[PDB]
Amino acid sequence: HMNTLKKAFEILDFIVKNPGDVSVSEIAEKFNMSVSNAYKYMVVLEEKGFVLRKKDKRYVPGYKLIEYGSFVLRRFNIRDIAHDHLVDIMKRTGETVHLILKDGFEGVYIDKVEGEQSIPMVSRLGMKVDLYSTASGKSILAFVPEKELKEYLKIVELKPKTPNTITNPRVLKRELEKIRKRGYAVDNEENEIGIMCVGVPIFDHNGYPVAGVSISGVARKFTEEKIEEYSDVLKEKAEEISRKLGY
Amino acid sequence: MNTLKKAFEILDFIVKNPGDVSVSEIAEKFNMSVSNAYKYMVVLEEKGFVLRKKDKRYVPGYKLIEYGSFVLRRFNIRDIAHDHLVDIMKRTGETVHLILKDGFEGVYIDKVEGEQSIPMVSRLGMKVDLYSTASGKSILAFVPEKELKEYLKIVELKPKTPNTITNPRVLKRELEKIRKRGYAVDNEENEIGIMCVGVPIFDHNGYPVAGVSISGVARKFTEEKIEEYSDVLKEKAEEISRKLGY
Amino acid sequence: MNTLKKAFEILDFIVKNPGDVSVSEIAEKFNMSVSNAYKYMVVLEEKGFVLRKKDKRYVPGYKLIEYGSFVLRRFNIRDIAHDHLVDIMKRTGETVHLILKDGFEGVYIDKVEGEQSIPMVSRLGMKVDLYSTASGKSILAFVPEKELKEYLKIVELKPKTPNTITNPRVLKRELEKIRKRGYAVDNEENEIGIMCVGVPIFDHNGYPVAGVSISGVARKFTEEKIEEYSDVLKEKAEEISRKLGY
Amino acid sequence: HMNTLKKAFEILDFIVKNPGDVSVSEIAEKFNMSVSNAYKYMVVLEEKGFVLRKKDKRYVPGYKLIEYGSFVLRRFNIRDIAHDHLVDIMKRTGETVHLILKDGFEGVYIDKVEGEQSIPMVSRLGMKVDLYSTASGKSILAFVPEKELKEYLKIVELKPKTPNTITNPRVLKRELEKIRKRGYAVDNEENEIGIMCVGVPIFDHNGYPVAGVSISGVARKFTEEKIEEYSDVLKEKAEEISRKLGY
Ligand SMILES: [Zn+2]
Ligand SMILES: [Zn+2]
Ligand SMILES: [Zn+2]
Ligand SMILES: [Zn+2]
Incomplete structure (x- = not known):
């Protein structure tokens, strides 16, 4: 069951390649799950900085990933x-x-x-x-x-x-x-x-x-x-x- | 269900670590069985956020750059x-x-x-x-x-x-x-x-x-x-x- | 409470009318007492959306330009x-x-x-x-x-x-x-x-x-x-x- | 009472001079009235084109006023x-x-x-x-x-x-x-x-x-x-x- 991890990385991969933004409601409907449990993934992704939440509560990618890329490039x-x-x-x-x-x-x-x-x-x-x-x-x-x-x-x-x-x-x-x-x-x-x-x-x-x-x-x-x-x-x-x- | 925590937490450690780390080391450091750590590691490697070197030790993956630049470009x-x-x-x-x-x-x-x-x-x-x-x-x-x-x-x-x-x-x-x-x-x-x-x-x-x-x-x-x-x-x-x- | 309708409706007529109109004419055209039309007209003139000429007939006001340009500028x-x-x-x-x-x-x-x-x-x-x-x-x-x-x-x-x-x-x-x-x-x-x-x-x-x-x-x-x-x-x-x- | 007209033109004058946008909720709190009655003014203003409603349900000035200004300038x-x-x-x-x-x-x-x-x-x-x-x-x-x-x-x-x-x-x-x-x-x-x-x-x-x-x-x-x-x-x-x- 622990491969919830997979779901997490599928939702995230999606927000990154998604033109524009996404609502908690939309992700739930996207990955067959209640708005309640979508919040489970979205709250952590938000708290970690992978995603940014708009005043309108819609979601956009955060800066974390940008920082991560630099860290890896920083290795060469x-x-x-x-x-x-x-x-x-x-x-x-x-x-x-x-x-x-x-x-x-x-x-x-x-x-x-x-x-x-x-x-x-x-x-x-x-x-x-x-x-x-x-x-x-x-x-x-x-x-x-x-x-x-x-x-x-x-x-x-x-x-x-x-x-x-x-x-x-x-x-x-x-x-x-x-x-x-x-x-x-x-x-x-x-x-x-x-x-x-x-x-x-x-x-x-x-x-x-x-x-x-x-x-x-x-x-x-x-x-x-x-x-x-x-x-x-x-x-x-x-x-x-x-x-x-x-x- | 908040294993999502350890996941990004292990990911964060690897990305910010100048050297490498083996599955067992991630297990010891993040307090879990070698079998559970292999789980976080099997998935991170899966999605390409991690790379396993010939000597088995892990280092961050190229996907983080792919995602990084793709995000920066449209930030x-x-x-x-x-x-x-x-x-x-x-x-x-x-x-x-x-x-x-x-x-x-x-x-x-x-x-x-x-x-x-x-x-x-x-x-x-x-x-x-x-x-x-x-x-x-x-x-x-x-x-x-x-x-x-x-x-x-x-x-x-x-x-x-x-x-x-x-x-x-x-x-x-x-x-x-x-x-x-x-x-x-x-x-x-x-x-x-x-x-x-x-x-x-x-x-x-x-x-x-x-x-x-x-x-x-x-x-x-x-x-x-x-x-x-x-x-x-x-x-x-x-x-x-x-x-x-x- | 939808007199808000007649209001903008009367305002629309005036702005799109090349000539002018008197209060009584607005009353006749929009089916109301001369006293009620004087109400729509007293307020529109109040906020400057309308101007009353010496001959008493009304024409659109300068405020519509003020608002127009201010809005266009930040559209x-x-x-x-x-x-x-x-x-x-x-x-x-x-x-x-x-x-x-x-x-x-x-x-x-x-x-x-x-x-x-x-x-x-x-x-x-x-x-x-x-x-x-x-x-x-x-x-x-x-x-x-x-x-x-x-x-x-x-x-x-x-x-x-x-x-x-x-x-x-x-x-x-x-x-x-x-x-x-x-x-x-x-x-x-x-x-x-x-x-x-x-x-x-x-x-x-x-x-x-x-x-x-x-x-x-x-x-x-x-x-x-x-x-x-x-x-x-x-x-x-x-x-x-x-x-x-x- | 018919001077509701006044209230209408005060709300509108406000959205025009307001930097950014405004929610139905905010206007209500602004002009002492229920969200219910704010909708009374906002729905007509929106239907007439004086205001534009965002996907996030927040309000921004419409094109009507722009059209009105041109009509008046058009008179000179x-x-x-x-x-x-x-x-x-x-x-x-x-x-x-x-x-x-x-x-x-x-x-x-x-x-x-x-x-x-x-x-x-x-x-x-x-x-x-x-x-x-x-x-x-x-x-x-x-x-x-x-x-x-x-x-x-x-x-x-x-x-x-x-x-x-x-x-x-x-x-x-x-x-x-x-x-x-x-x-x-x-x-x-x-x-x-x-x-x-x-x-x-x-x-x-x-x-x-x-x-x-x-x-x-x-x-x-x-x-x-x-x-x-x-x-x-x-x-x-x-x-x-x-x-x-x-x-
Ligand atoms: Zn080449
Ligand atoms: Zn071209
Ligand atoms: Zn001068
Ligand atoms: Zn300067």
């Missing part, structure tokens, strides 16, 4: 070591910049600087990224010790998200080497259609690929020269950041 | 502060503004003016010079050392009025004064004939995300009105900032 | 429309914006984006090019003849995108199309990779005070999605405009 | 005949512009174009103006047939609003003539301290002073040359507008 020294180089990359390219943290066979958005114009990409901090269909991703898969690598191609599926999503490990391997060659990667609409990217890795103590920095924007912009320009500023900050990581 | 200080603003207008009768910080500029996110107050040209979604205003200067006074140093290194301090501070060094002094004063005053620095008293609104990290202020005809702003005015501002400003997690 | 279309906006987002899952007209520019007064929608750089209190957007073009389509002629005579139609209309004559055509179409569509005219469908919000005088729109990745905007999308917009737009007295 | 042809010249005067001076309608021994603000900066003046449409302590006012009192004039000085008090508010009819008369001379007036902080103005009249069919147009701003700006400049653009539009009034 790289974030503070890079943030400004990212803001600079955005001011010198005008393009959105991403920084993905390497976590196993997945990546996580740990920082993002929006560009001058909105781009048809759905990314946000905390979100996860496929290390194969993305530039900063392959850029990372192009330096993981061969051993670890070999296993990735062995485990991770390659469900093609777009007609350009590489689904063959022999091509992906060669692809990765090309990246080792140039020293960066390119996402020719392999992750999201309409969007292309350029990425470079970030090494740590023992030169392991612990991060990925990339420039993202609409396909139109990424020309041969543009690419050369982006990967240029990218590698420049990469090297500087990597240094801080004791490399 | 509305205006919907939260408005009534306080209206209130500020009931105890002073002078128009009131709320300014949001947008880098090195401020945005007017709300304004409560009374029938008796001065009609102002300022309107929602209008830029605010951070250096020539009380709310803006209040925001500057608390900005992080490095950022303020930067502000002064890039922003042009135009002479819009005879009183406008135009010397970065003279301004930094003003801020250090405001910083210690607790509030700022616009002595016809933004506009001629108009004065303002402004305080900052802090977020949970203590960052000056915005400022509230009172604007009126210069004359009305006497040493005693200002002290009177400011006090009202902070009072309502603490409430707002507290609701932001401060 | 908040955003507080009025917001929930509708949230609603627009529940039936389309695509971010939604509300744009206020500020002369020849538009101001973003609100935006409801969903977890599934495209993260947009646009934010409250940000300028909107009226010629390169769906909400903005919707506002143009209904602007008063003389004003639009003027708009085209002073505004620079920059080529921000390959699709942006830059020919005043070509634009006026688009508007006449939108005017008759009932809504507007931003075919990657504002930004590349993004499309929008937008309708106007009218005030009581039929003036396009603002516009609501749906924004999403260009691809998603198919002939059927657009028709689907627009319909939702007007539905919610009529409600808003109706609450503005339209 | 001069308004539409001048409005643009006013917008032009503001764009060519950067100063706030006013247009007061002559109504007996008082004036009424019938149009106003705000300037680039907020000025310490409290003016709004519909408001009334003393025809003696204001520029557009004296500018009008400088052309009213002497007969009518003589009576004004005879009736209207001159309660000095500021150390510069003329309280002597002999000085006011001479003052007025100076105005007839120059062809315009000047408010050296005679109406409001901190504020100075420059005004010119607007004549009708039989050349009667039916209106007043003026430029308003902080005292600092009104220099000998500035004044000359303002009264220049002022008289220019005046003449043009007056023409339309069949003059």
Whole structure:
């Protein structure tokens, strides 16, 4: 029965993703329960700061979650070591910049600087990224010790998200080497259609690929020269950041 | 049924713990069987609020960032502060503004003016010079050392009025004064004939995300009105900032 | 106790009457004794909602202007429309914006984006090019003849995108199309990779005070999605405009 | 008893001048009456559009009053005949512009174009103006047939609003003539301290002073040359507008 816990986290997950607000009455009707017991969950969520109650007694998300996110981001020294180089990359390219943290066979958005114009990409901090269909991703898969690598191609599926999503490990391997060659990667609409990217890795103590920095924007912009320009500023900050990581 | 308590309580410990913790350690610390703690832990890991490392110890999960940013992105200080603003207008009768910080500029996110107050040209979604205003200067006074140093290194301090501070060094002094004063005053620095008293609104990290202020005809702003005015501002400003997690 | 009815009813007649009226005429028309009508009239004149001319005939009072402007000045279309906006987002899952007209520019007064929608750089209190957007073009389509002629005579139609209309004559055509179409569509005219469908919000005088729109990745905007999308917009737009007295 | 009418107009006057909103409960407590009878007034006010009821059942002013004001303003042809010249005067001076309608021994603000900066003046449409302590006012009192004039000085008090508010009819008369001379007036902080103005009249069919147009701003700006400049653009539009009034 103790999995009441589940119910709690379902109600909360709902208020966070809910556009606007919600009344005690509405949550009850939502999760088959009396207004009385809804108050059981809502009063604790409110007291803990996960939710804010309006003068009209309707509910809105609180600040707690915001504080929690910062605490977790606060655990990645790289974030503070890079943030400004990212803001600079955005001011010198005008393009959105991403920084993905390497976590196993997945990546996580740990920082993002929006560009001058909105781009048809759905990314946000905390979100996860496929290390194969993305530039900063392959850029990372192009330096993981061969051993670890070999296993990735062995485990991770390659469900093609777009007609350009590489689904063959022999091509992906060669692809990765090309990246080792140039020293960066390119996402020719392999992750999201309409969007292309350029990425470079970030090494740590023992030169392991612990991060990925990339420039993202609409396909139109990424020309041969543009690419050369982006990967240029990218590698420049990469090297500087990597240094801080004791490399 | 208030296990909801231990749940968020265990979640709070993990998020605020720099290192990690094992299920048994959570059990010992929060006084419960290893089987019950595995329950809180099985669900928190389930919803992604927690991550279990190879060595089995737990650390906070990525979902907290996902939720954090998603919430911050749609948080509305205006919907939260408005009534306080209206209130500020009931105890002073002078128009009131709320300014949001947008880098090195401020945005007017709300304004409560009374029938008796001065009609102002300022309107929602209008830029605010951070250096020539009380709310803006209040925001500057608390900005992080490095950022303020930067502000002064890039922003042009135009002479819009005879009183406008135009010397970065003279301004930094003003801020250090405001910083210690607790509030700022616009002595016809933004506009001629108009004065303002402004305080900052802090977020949970203590960052000056915005400022509230009172604007009126210069004359009305006497040493005693200002002290009177400011006090009202902070009072309502603490409430707002507290609701932001401060 | 519903004499409150005849009162505003008599007030309504006077305000909407181009000429004047005497107490006896109000009595005859609204079926009452000359003494009772003098009562409604004594109070309306009292509160200044009515003025008695030298020839004794009555005409509307200056207070109606005083109240009118005081109310207009603080009317908040955003507080009025917001929930509708949230609603627009529940039936389309695509971010939604509300744009206020500020002369020849538009101001973003609100935006409801969903977890599934495209993260947009646009934010409250940000300028909107009226010629390169769906909400903005919707506002143009209904602007008063003389004003639009003027708009085209002073505004620079920059080529921000390959699709942006830059020919005043070509634009006026688009508007006449939108005017008759009932809504507007931003075919990657504002930004590349993004499309929008937008309708106007009218005030009581039929003036396009603002516009609501749906924004999403260009691809998603198919002939059927657009028709689907627009319909939702007007539905919610009529409600808003109706609450503005339209 | 029928003066329930009074109560109605007191409640309404209150919601209009009330910052924020009000609940049925609050109005009742405000005007000593049961929530039940408050609904009597609030339901009609709502049905007539004078008030708007929120989802939270709290009340906010409606659009009706806005519509009513326009209808009354709609009765002064001069308004539409001048409005643009006013917008032009503001764009060519950067100063706030006013247009007061002559109504007996008082004036009424019938149009106003705000300037680039907020000025310490409290003016709004519909408001009334003393025809003696204001520029557009004296500018009008400088052309009213002497007969009518003589009576004004005879009736209207001159309660000095500021150390510069003329309280002597002999000085006011001479003052007025100076105005007839120059062809315009000047408010050296005679109406409001901190504020100075420059005004010119607007004549009708039989050349009667039916209106007043003026430029308003902080005292600092009104220099000998500035004044000359303002009264220049002022008289220019005046003449043009007056023409339309069949003059
Ligand atoms: Zn990428
Ligand atoms: Zn200020
Ligand atoms: Zn658009
Ligand atoms: Zn004046």
